[PDB]
Amino acid sequence: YDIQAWKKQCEELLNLIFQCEDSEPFRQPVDLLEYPDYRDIIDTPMDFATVRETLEAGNYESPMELCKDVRLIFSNSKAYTPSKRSRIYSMSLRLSAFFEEHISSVLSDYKSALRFHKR
Numbered sequence: 001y002d003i004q005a006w007k008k009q010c011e012e013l014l015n016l017i018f019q020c021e022d023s024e025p026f027r028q029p030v031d032l033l034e035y036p037d038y039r040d041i042i043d044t045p046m047d048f049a050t051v052r053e054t055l056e057a058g059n060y061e062s063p064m065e066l067c068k069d070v071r072l073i074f075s076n077s078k079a080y081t082p083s084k085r086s087r088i089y090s091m092s093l094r095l096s097a098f099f100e101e102h103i104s105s106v107l108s109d110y111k112s113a114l115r116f117h118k119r
């Protein structure tokens with residue numbers, strides 16, 4: 001029933017993602033000195049510190065908006081990878097599976113609570 005519970009649930013999921021070794025390439029914006037052509041391929045950079053900062057600033061209205069930004073981290077890694085077997089892309093696939101497994105109930109509970117609110 002709680003329309004606000006998604007926020008702390010997302011904060012706790014972000015804490016687990018930060019503890020995950022697979023999140024290391026995605027914890028801060030991609031370094032353009034390391035990947036000089038990054039912005040030639042990627043239009044909208046995104047990383048987990050920016051997602052956490054947006055959430056803590058009160059700049060997400062719903063967990064769907066947070067989920068769109070986290071999915072953008074993974075789609076950027078898929079678009080920038082030179083190979084489907086690269087180390088960083090392989091880490092992104094595992095982290096994506098972990099994130100999707102945990103965000104599903106957060107989205108479901110929020111949408112259910114909102115439908116109840118508008119009944």
Ligand SMILES: CCn1cc(CCO)cn1
Binds near residue numbers: 030076077078087088
């Ligand atoms: C640094 C962000 N990033 C790197 C890749 C592939 C490197 O093999 C995808 N995203």
